[PDB]
């Protein structure tokens, strides 16, 4: 459960209200390919030895083209970004095994075990393609695709129903999107958060507002 | 009596708030406890050696081989303890900045009145009361928040005897037909008076100037 | 400057990539990674609070009247327009003056978006500006008390010690001088100043780029590539050469998180200063010398900026 994954990340079963960035606890099998022979598998996270380039990554077709001498492509961090295997001189882009950061918006664990999952920086159409939902548990398949799937600039939020109504921010997700445990059957809702009440000051050329009373108010400031 | 009753009701409201907010102090205590607990937990790390504890590495391996393994543990433990000292220095700088802010609020707000907006509460600041707190201070900012605003028709100046009259400290308002001078923060309408308003210039230079009679206190005393 | 780019790192991706053996050894390092996540999450929450303390100083969003005549003073260069992200012209110049991320995303360094987007920060700016123009300092102390803007500028003149007749005899001169000064501010922005915000963005991009370049380092191990040394070394010995690699990359990650904590403390101090200037100078007049411009401070306008706020001190 992303909630149990949150319990694994926080090292505690009592999870407070808020958003928690969880580690990728879920594991996946990687096949071993050696080509200098092994049949090439593309569009999935496999281990590779393309002319002694080592590495592990999802193999995809690459628009970028190599000069005839070049046998591989290198990235900024001196990791391999493109390869050109000797058996077939085609270019293969090295995507990493695609994981977005899983952030679990959750109310109090005591308040509810219901949770919403935000996948950061990926699109909602490609979210079962990205996190490889076909190899995981069906509990994760509930949170990878289904109903209540919303798109935020922050990423794909799955498990929170977007409401047009605007409320004070409770769990900050990002770009104005906030989530809260509200009655709508109490469930997790998501909304664009409210700045405040809209007010219009009645300015004129000869109009002033003067108070006829007051309020002696004591406020608490803790430092 | 209204100010005393509103102050007592506000003190009761502060009591009902606290009795039911102190997130910064508990956050500081929780960060210190979490840093000490993380420093305790980091002793379970083997740091690439065969074991986390010193004694089985001295009993198992011969002295030349241990001096590499225990050096790997010592360097890592020094790193964890350098990370802790660095994060304590950064949080101590943050607490030092907050204590400098609290000392400037205790000088400017408790020891005198402040004309700095929102430096001593939301509203017109009157005074503040300091209270002790666990590793902190709590200021009760007594503020004057003005209320019951009422619309009035206003003017910048008054034409009287071909002269422009401006208020010394206040504002011209009108209830319908009648024009008065009053203060700004509270509504106390007074008769527009030469003692209240000072004369400057002519009526042609002021934009939005209106006509009214400025009462002179010397004129009824001359008839008496 | 008010905020800083919120960055979060995944240790399993930055120090190991997709190697399973490396991740198991990284697990041996243990709470070392949890501590570096807590620091970055606290930095991100701190940068969201710093934006909320600077810009959300008003409880009610104020709107400008549909006819805009405030004592002859022109505010159309600083008030937002309904044609556009509803930002003003001087805010559009400020967002246009301050300006590879996929490679950082492929190395586990992701950039969280801010909680308040730039349209919402611009609405906060427009609300504080509408309160400043229509009500003066009265919306800061309590409810918004309307006032003519000439009489508000007379209250500011009495605040700086100048008698009220100086404005009412020279209102056209003061309005024309204000409009000419706002035109100079426009020309000083469009023709040519925003060095602090670009320095903040360049420092976060350079620290992120230095963290990307730290992967190309062998740190004394035979090879930077984790898989290469697994095949070119015996399994007990390879653990010594990855441990040397995980120790070096964790030292680089500590260096990045330490410098980001120091920079976040500096940005937090600057945001506390900006929030202090927004209460004292925008929501009231200031008798503090050179805290709101060089001169007898009259008034101030807030204007959104990329990770920052620009005060127009009149
Ligand atoms: C996300 O998917 C939708 C629907 O296919 C598409 O219109 C949109 O452009 C996609 N966005 C990105 C960033 O790929
Ligand atoms: C001011 O408010 C108090 C209660 O807050 C009320 O008792 C009092 O009558 C009010 N005064 C005026 C003049 O309205
Ligand atoms: C003042 O006038 C405005 C516009 O006519 C109105 O909305 C408001 O209720 C009036 N009263 C007060 C106390 O502001
Ligand atoms: C205005 O105030 C004066 C003095 O208090 C009073 O005589 C008058 O009836 C009030 N109302 C109007 C509409 O002038
Ligand atoms: C005020 O009185 C003068 C002289 O009686 C007159 O010229 C002027 O027009 C009056 N002002 C207004 C606004 O009627
Ligand atoms: C009165 O108000 C409107 C809008 O505030 C403005 O267009 C008009 O010119 C003003 N008249 C004067 C000069 O007082
Ligand atoms: C304010 O300035 C702009 C451009 O300088 C101009 O288009 C606009 O008409 C001015 N406003 C008024 C009320 O003249």
Short mmCIF file of N, CA and C in Angstrom, two decimals, chain A residues 55-191:
data_model
loop_
_atom_site.label_atom_id
_atom_site.label_comp_id
_atom_site.label_asym_id
_atom_site.label_seq_id
_atom_site.Cartn_x
_atom_site.Cartn_y
_atom_site.Cartn_z
N UNK A 55 25.77 -1.14 -17.47
CA UNK A 55 24.52 -0.36 -17.27
C UNK A 55 23.23 -1.17 -17.13
N UNK A 56 22.07 -0.53 -16.84
CA UNK A 56 20.70 -1.15 -16.71
C UNK A 56 19.69 -0.05 -17.09
N UNK A 57 18.69 -0.28 -17.97
CA UNK A 57 17.86 0.84 -18.43
C UNK A 57 16.84 0.39 -19.44
N UNK A 58 15.84 1.22 -19.69
CA UNK A 58 14.79 0.89 -20.68
C UNK A 58 15.33 1.28 -22.06
N UNK A 59 15.31 0.36 -23.01
CA UNK A 59 15.89 0.59 -24.36
C UNK A 59 14.78 1.08 -25.30
N UNK A 60 14.97 2.24 -25.92
CA UNK A 60 13.93 2.83 -26.81
C UNK A 60 14.60 3.33 -28.09
N UNK A 61 13.83 3.49 -29.18
CA UNK A 61 14.40 4.06 -30.43
C UNK A 61 14.82 5.51 -30.18
N UNK A 62 15.90 5.96 -30.81
CA UNK A 62 16.43 7.33 -30.54
C UNK A 62 16.38 8.19 -31.80
N UNK A 63 15.77 9.38 -31.71
CA UNK A 63 15.77 10.33 -32.85
C UNK A 63 17.21 10.78 -33.12
N UNK A 64 17.99 10.98 -32.05
CA UNK A 64 19.39 11.49 -32.20
C UNK A 64 20.21 10.50 -33.03
N UNK A 65 21.07 11.02 -33.91
CA UNK A 65 21.87 10.14 -34.81
C UNK A 65 23.35 10.26 -34.46
N UNK A 66 24.09 9.15 -34.56
CA UNK A 66 25.55 9.14 -34.28
C UNK A 66 26.35 9.35 -35.56
N UNK A 67 27.56 9.90 -35.43
CA UNK A 67 28.46 9.99 -36.61
C UNK A 67 28.98 8.57 -36.84
N UNK A 68 29.51 8.20 -38.03
CA UNK A 68 29.88 6.80 -38.29
C UNK A 68 30.90 6.23 -37.29
N UNK A 69 31.89 7.03 -36.89
CA UNK A 69 32.90 6.56 -35.90
C UNK A 69 32.26 6.29 -34.54
N UNK A 70 31.30 7.12 -34.10
CA UNK A 70 30.75 6.97 -32.72
C UNK A 70 30.07 5.61 -32.54
N UNK A 71 30.39 4.92 -31.44
CA UNK A 71 29.83 3.59 -31.12
C UNK A 71 28.85 3.71 -29.96
N UNK A 72 28.85 4.82 -29.22
CA UNK A 72 27.90 5.07 -28.11
C UNK A 72 27.76 6.57 -27.89
N UNK A 73 26.87 6.98 -27.01
CA UNK A 73 26.56 8.39 -26.72
C UNK A 73 26.68 8.54 -25.24
N UNK A 74 27.11 9.69 -24.75
CA UNK A 74 27.38 9.87 -23.31
C UNK A 74 26.54 11.04 -22.87
N UNK A 75 26.13 11.04 -21.61
CA UNK A 75 25.32 12.11 -21.06
C UNK A 75 26.20 13.13 -20.34
N UNK A 76 25.56 14.03 -19.59
CA UNK A 76 26.28 15.07 -18.84
C UNK A 76 27.03 14.46 -17.66
N UNK A 77 26.40 13.52 -16.95
CA UNK A 77 26.97 12.92 -15.74
C UNK A 77 27.96 11.79 -16.01
N UNK A 78 28.48 11.69 -17.24
CA UNK A 78 29.31 10.60 -17.77
C UNK A 78 28.64 9.24 -17.65
N UNK A 79 27.32 9.19 -17.71
CA UNK A 79 26.60 7.94 -17.88
C UNK A 79 26.18 7.79 -19.34
N UNK A 80 25.89 6.56 -19.74
CA UNK A 80 25.59 6.29 -21.14
C UNK A 80 24.15 6.70 -21.45
N UNK A 81 23.98 7.53 -22.48
CA UNK A 81 22.68 8.08 -22.85
C UNK A 81 22.19 7.49 -24.17
N UNK A 82 23.10 7.17 -25.09
CA UNK A 82 22.72 6.51 -26.33
C UNK A 82 23.75 5.43 -26.63
N UNK A 83 23.30 4.36 -27.26
CA UNK A 83 24.21 3.26 -27.65
C UNK A 83 23.97 2.97 -29.12
N UNK A 84 24.86 2.25 -29.78
CA UNK A 84 24.68 1.75 -31.17
C UNK A 84 25.27 0.34 -31.14
N UNK A 85 24.44 -0.68 -30.94
CA UNK A 85 24.98 -2.06 -30.78
C UNK A 85 25.68 -2.53 -32.06
N UNK A 86 26.78 -3.30 -31.96
CA UNK A 86 27.49 -3.81 -33.14
C UNK A 86 26.70 -4.80 -34.01
N UNK A 87 25.96 -5.72 -33.38
CA UNK A 87 25.18 -6.74 -34.14
C UNK A 87 24.32 -6.03 -35.18
N UNK A 88 23.50 -5.07 -34.74
CA UNK A 88 22.66 -4.27 -35.67
C UNK A 88 23.02 -2.81 -35.42
N UNK A 89 23.55 -2.10 -36.41
CA UNK A 89 24.03 -0.71 -36.15
C UNK A 89 22.84 0.25 -36.06
N UNK A 90 21.93 0.03 -35.11
CA UNK A 90 20.79 0.95 -34.91
C UNK A 90 21.09 1.76 -33.65
N UNK A 91 20.52 2.96 -33.54
CA UNK A 91 20.73 3.76 -32.30
C UNK A 91 19.64 3.40 -31.28
N UNK A 92 20.03 3.22 -30.01
CA UNK A 92 19.05 2.86 -28.95
C UNK A 92 19.20 3.84 -27.78
N UNK A 93 18.19 4.67 -27.54
CA UNK A 93 18.25 5.64 -26.46
C UNK A 93 18.11 4.92 -25.12
N UNK A 94 18.90 5.36 -24.14
CA UNK A 94 18.92 4.74 -22.83
C UNK A 94 18.07 5.60 -21.91
N UNK A 95 16.78 5.31 -21.86
CA UNK A 95 15.98 5.85 -20.80
C UNK A 95 16.35 5.10 -19.52
N UNK A 96 16.36 5.72 -18.35
CA UNK A 96 16.43 4.92 -17.12
C UNK A 96 15.11 4.22 -16.86
N UNK A 97 15.15 3.26 -15.94
CA UNK A 97 13.94 2.55 -15.52
C UNK A 97 13.01 3.54 -14.84
N UNK A 98 11.88 3.81 -15.50
CA UNK A 98 11.15 5.06 -15.29
C UNK A 98 10.42 5.06 -13.95
N UNK A 99 10.88 5.93 -13.05
CA UNK A 99 10.22 6.15 -11.78
C UNK A 99 10.05 7.65 -11.59
N UNK A 100 8.82 8.07 -11.32
CA UNK A 100 8.59 9.39 -10.79
C UNK A 100 8.55 9.29 -9.28
N UNK A 101 8.77 10.40 -8.58
CA UNK A 101 8.68 10.41 -7.14
C UNK A 101 7.26 10.20 -6.66
N UNK A 102 7.04 9.17 -5.85
CA UNK A 102 5.72 8.86 -5.33
C UNK A 102 5.54 9.66 -4.05
N UNK A 103 4.55 10.56 -4.04
CA UNK A 103 4.21 11.34 -2.87
C UNK A 103 2.83 10.93 -2.41
N UNK A 104 2.71 10.55 -1.14
CA UNK A 104 1.45 10.00 -0.67
C UNK A 104 0.72 11.02 0.19
N UNK A 105 -0.31 11.65 -0.38
CA UNK A 105 -1.15 12.55 0.39
C UNK A 105 -2.06 11.72 1.27
N UNK A 106 -1.90 11.86 2.58
CA UNK A 106 -2.67 11.00 3.51
C UNK A 106 -3.19 11.81 4.70
N UNK A 107 -4.44 11.64 5.19
CA UNK A 107 -4.87 12.33 6.41
C UNK A 107 -4.21 11.59 7.59
N UNK A 108 -4.71 11.78 8.80
CA UNK A 108 -4.14 10.99 9.91
C UNK A 108 -4.38 9.51 9.64
N UNK A 109 -3.41 8.65 9.95
CA UNK A 109 -3.63 7.19 9.79
C UNK A 109 -4.80 6.81 10.70
N UNK A 110 -4.84 7.39 11.90
CA UNK A 110 -5.99 7.14 12.81
C UNK A 110 -7.27 7.68 12.16
N UNK A 111 -7.21 8.86 11.53
CA UNK A 111 -8.42 9.48 10.93
C UNK A 111 -8.95 8.60 9.79
N UNK A 112 -8.06 8.14 8.90
CA UNK A 112 -8.49 7.24 7.79
C UNK A 112 -7.29 6.49 7.21
N UNK A 113 -7.53 5.33 6.59
CA UNK A 113 -6.43 4.60 5.90
C UNK A 113 -6.50 4.94 4.40
N UNK A 114 -7.49 5.75 4.00
CA UNK A 114 -7.61 6.17 2.58
C UNK A 114 -6.42 7.07 2.24
N UNK A 115 -5.83 6.88 1.06
CA UNK A 115 -4.64 7.67 0.66
C UNK A 115 -4.73 8.05 -0.82
N UNK A 116 -4.07 9.15 -1.21
CA UNK A 116 -3.99 9.53 -2.61
C UNK A 116 -2.53 9.57 -3.01
N UNK A 117 -2.23 9.22 -4.26
CA UNK A 117 -0.85 9.09 -4.72
C UNK A 117 -0.61 10.12 -5.82
N UNK A 118 0.42 10.94 -5.63
CA UNK A 118 0.87 11.90 -6.63
C UNK A 118 2.17 11.40 -7.24
N UNK A 119 2.16 11.24 -8.56
CA UNK A 119 3.35 10.87 -9.32
C UNK A 119 3.88 12.15 -9.95
N UNK A 120 5.11 12.52 -9.58
CA UNK A 120 5.62 13.84 -9.90
C UNK A 120 6.26 13.85 -11.29
N UNK A 121 5.79 14.75 -12.15
CA UNK A 121 6.44 15.03 -13.41
C UNK A 121 6.09 14.11 -14.56
N UNK A 122 5.10 13.23 -14.42
CA UNK A 122 4.69 12.33 -15.48
C UNK A 122 3.26 12.65 -15.88
N UNK A 123 2.83 12.13 -17.02
CA UNK A 123 1.50 12.41 -17.54
C UNK A 123 0.54 11.31 -17.11
N UNK A 124 -0.75 11.67 -17.01
CA UNK A 124 -1.74 10.73 -16.49
C UNK A 124 -2.09 9.64 -17.50
N UNK A 125 -1.82 9.87 -18.79
CA UNK A 125 -2.05 8.82 -19.77
C UNK A 125 -0.95 7.76 -19.74
N UNK A 126 0.28 8.15 -19.40
CA UNK A 126 1.43 7.26 -19.44
C UNK A 126 1.81 6.73 -18.06
N UNK A 127 1.00 6.96 -17.04
CA UNK A 127 1.33 6.53 -15.68
C UNK A 127 1.27 5.01 -15.46
N UNK A 128 0.46 4.16 -16.14
CA UNK A 128 0.75 2.72 -16.01
C UNK A 128 1.93 2.28 -16.85
N UNK A 129 2.25 3.02 -17.91
CA UNK A 129 3.43 2.73 -18.72
C UNK A 129 4.70 3.08 -17.96
N UNK A 130 4.64 4.14 -17.14
CA UNK A 130 5.84 4.64 -16.47
C UNK A 130 6.25 3.73 -15.31
N UNK A 131 5.38 3.56 -14.31
CA UNK A 131 5.76 2.86 -13.09
C UNK A 131 5.66 1.34 -13.20
N UNK A 132 5.33 0.82 -14.39
CA UNK A 132 5.21 -0.62 -14.70
C UNK A 132 4.19 -1.31 -13.79
N UNK A 133 2.93 -0.90 -13.94
CA UNK A 133 1.87 -1.36 -13.05
C UNK A 133 1.46 -2.80 -13.30
N UNK A 134 1.88 -3.37 -14.44
CA UNK A 134 1.55 -4.75 -14.87
C UNK A 134 2.41 -5.77 -14.14
N UNK A 135 3.46 -5.35 -13.44
CA UNK A 135 4.32 -6.23 -12.66
C UNK A 135 4.11 -6.10 -11.16
N UNK A 136 3.23 -5.21 -10.71
CA UNK A 136 3.06 -4.96 -9.29
C UNK A 136 1.81 -5.65 -8.75
N UNK A 137 1.52 -5.38 -7.48
CA UNK A 137 0.32 -5.89 -6.83
C UNK A 137 -0.92 -5.18 -7.38
N UNK A 138 -2.09 -5.83 -7.34
CA UNK A 138 -3.34 -5.14 -7.73
C UNK A 138 -3.73 -3.98 -6.82
N UNK A 139 -3.24 -3.95 -5.57
CA UNK A 139 -3.43 -2.79 -4.71
C UNK A 139 -2.74 -1.55 -5.28
N UNK A 140 -1.54 -1.73 -5.83
CA UNK A 140 -0.89 -0.65 -6.56
C UNK A 140 -1.53 -0.40 -7.92
N UNK A 141 -2.22 -1.40 -8.49
CA UNK A 141 -2.95 -1.19 -9.74
C UNK A 141 -4.20 -0.36 -9.51
N UNK A 142 -4.74 -0.37 -8.29
CA UNK A 142 -5.82 0.55 -7.93
C UNK A 142 -5.33 2.00 -7.97
N UNK A 143 -4.15 2.25 -7.42
CA UNK A 143 -3.62 3.61 -7.37
C UNK A 143 -2.84 4.01 -8.61
N UNK A 144 -2.64 3.11 -9.57
CA UNK A 144 -1.95 3.48 -10.80
C UNK A 144 -2.91 3.90 -11.90
N UNK A 145 -4.10 3.30 -11.95
CA UNK A 145 -5.11 3.65 -12.94
C UNK A 145 -6.49 3.40 -12.35
N UNK A 146 -7.49 4.05 -12.94
CA UNK A 146 -8.85 3.89 -12.48
C UNK A 146 -9.57 5.23 -12.52
N UNK A 147 -10.48 5.41 -11.56
CA UNK A 147 -11.24 6.64 -11.45
C UNK A 147 -10.49 7.66 -10.59
N UNK A 148 -11.03 8.88 -10.52
CA UNK A 148 -10.42 9.96 -9.69
C UNK A 148 -8.98 10.22 -10.13
N UNK A 149 -8.73 10.29 -11.44
CA UNK A 149 -7.39 10.61 -11.91
C UNK A 149 -7.39 12.05 -12.41
N UNK A 150 -6.59 12.92 -11.77
CA UNK A 150 -6.54 14.38 -12.07
C UNK A 150 -5.14 14.72 -12.56
N UNK A 151 -4.96 15.82 -13.29
CA UNK A 151 -3.62 16.30 -13.74
C UNK A 151 -3.35 17.65 -13.09
N UNK A 152 -2.19 17.83 -12.46
CA UNK A 152 -1.75 19.08 -11.82
C UNK A 152 -0.41 19.38 -12.50
N UNK A 153 0.06 20.63 -12.53
CA UNK A 153 1.41 20.89 -13.10
C UNK A 153 2.43 20.08 -12.28
N UNK A 154 2.14 19.85 -11.00
CA UNK A 154 3.01 19.07 -10.10
C UNK A 154 3.16 17.64 -10.62
N UNK A 155 2.10 17.05 -11.16
CA UNK A 155 2.12 15.68 -11.68
C UNK A 155 0.74 15.06 -11.72
N UNK A 156 0.62 13.74 -11.67
CA UNK A 156 -0.64 13.02 -11.78
C UNK A 156 -1.11 12.60 -10.39
N UNK A 157 -2.30 13.05 -10.00
CA UNK A 157 -2.86 12.77 -8.68
C UNK A 157 -3.99 11.77 -8.84
N UNK A 158 -3.84 10.58 -8.22
CA UNK A 158 -4.77 9.44 -8.39
C UNK A 158 -5.31 8.99 -7.04
N UNK A 159 -6.60 9.15 -6.78
CA UNK A 159 -7.21 8.85 -5.49
C UNK A 159 -7.86 10.02 -4.81
N UNK A 160 -7.76 11.22 -5.38
CA UNK A 160 -8.40 12.41 -4.83
C UNK A 160 -9.32 13.01 -5.89
N UNK A 161 -10.56 13.28 -5.50
CA UNK A 161 -11.57 13.79 -6.42
C UNK A 161 -11.47 15.30 -6.49
N UNK A 162 -11.25 15.84 -7.69
CA UNK A 162 -11.07 17.30 -7.83
C UNK A 162 -12.42 18.01 -7.64
N UNK A 163 -12.45 19.01 -6.76
CA UNK A 163 -13.71 19.79 -6.53
C UNK A 163 -13.48 21.23 -6.99
N UNK A 164 -14.44 21.80 -7.72
CA UNK A 164 -14.33 23.19 -8.22
C UNK A 164 -14.27 24.16 -7.03
N UNK A 165 -15.00 23.86 -5.95
CA UNK A 165 -15.06 24.78 -4.78
C UNK A 165 -13.66 24.98 -4.20
N UNK A 166 -13.35 26.20 -3.75
CA UNK A 166 -12.00 26.51 -3.23
C UNK A 166 -12.03 26.60 -1.70
N UNK A 167 -11.06 25.97 -1.03
CA UNK A 167 -11.03 25.94 0.46
C UNK A 167 -9.62 26.29 0.94
N UNK A 168 -9.47 26.62 2.23
CA UNK A 168 -8.12 26.89 2.80
C UNK A 168 -7.25 25.63 2.64
N UNK A 169 -5.98 25.79 2.27
CA UNK A 169 -5.08 24.67 2.01
C UNK A 169 -4.84 23.88 3.29
N UNK A 170 -4.96 22.56 3.19
CA UNK A 170 -4.72 21.66 4.32
C UNK A 170 -3.48 20.80 4.10
N UNK A 171 -3.43 20.05 3.00
CA UNK A 171 -2.23 19.31 2.62
C UNK A 171 -1.70 19.90 1.32
N UNK A 172 -0.56 20.59 1.34
CA UNK A 172 -0.08 21.25 0.12
C UNK A 172 0.52 20.27 -0.87
N UNK A 173 -0.10 20.18 -2.04
CA UNK A 173 0.41 19.38 -3.15
C UNK A 173 1.26 20.23 -4.09
N UNK A 174 0.73 21.36 -4.53
CA UNK A 174 1.52 22.25 -5.36
C UNK A 174 0.75 22.93 -6.48
N UNK A 175 1.26 24.09 -6.91
CA UNK A 175 0.70 24.94 -7.96
C UNK A 175 -0.75 25.33 -7.68
N UNK A 176 -1.06 25.59 -6.41
CA UNK A 176 -2.40 25.89 -5.99
C UNK A 176 -3.24 24.69 -5.62
N UNK A 177 -2.81 23.49 -5.97
CA UNK A 177 -3.58 22.28 -5.67
C UNK A 177 -3.29 21.86 -4.24
N UNK A 178 -4.35 21.68 -3.46
CA UNK A 178 -4.27 21.20 -2.09
C UNK A 178 -5.34 20.14 -1.88
N UNK A 179 -5.10 19.23 -0.94
CA UNK A 179 -6.03 18.15 -0.68
C UNK A 179 -6.44 18.15 0.79
N UNK A 180 -7.64 17.63 1.05
CA UNK A 180 -8.16 17.58 2.41
C UNK A 180 -9.16 16.43 2.52
N UNK A 181 -9.33 15.95 3.75
CA UNK A 181 -10.29 14.89 4.07
C UNK A 181 -11.61 15.57 4.44
N UNK A 182 -12.56 15.57 3.51
CA UNK A 182 -13.82 16.28 3.69
C UNK A 182 -15.00 15.38 3.36
N UNK A 183 -16.16 15.75 3.91
CA UNK A 183 -17.41 15.05 3.63
C UNK A 183 -17.99 15.55 2.32
N UNK A 184 -18.30 14.62 1.42
CA UNK A 184 -18.83 14.97 0.11
C UNK A 184 -20.06 14.14 -0.23
N UNK A 185 -19.28 8.94 3.94
CA UNK A 185 -18.77 9.20 2.56
C UNK A 185 -17.62 10.20 2.62
N UNK A 186 -17.07 10.43 3.81
CA UNK A 186 -15.92 11.37 3.96
C UNK A 186 -14.74 10.81 3.16
N UNK A 187 -14.23 11.59 2.20
CA UNK A 187 -13.15 11.09 1.36
C UNK A 187 -12.14 12.22 1.15
N UNK A 188 -11.06 11.90 0.43
CA UNK A 188 -10.00 12.85 0.12
C UNK A 188 -10.39 13.60 -1.14
N UNK A 189 -10.43 14.93 -1.01
CA UNK A 189 -10.82 15.83 -2.12
C UNK A 189 -9.58 16.62 -2.47
N UNK A 190 -9.49 17.15 -3.67
CA UNK A 190 -8.44 18.06 -4.09
C UNK A 190 -9.08 19.28 -4.72
N UNK A 191 -8.42 20.43 -4.57
CA UNK A 191 -9.01 21.69 -4.97
C UNK A 191 -7.92 22.72 -5.22
#
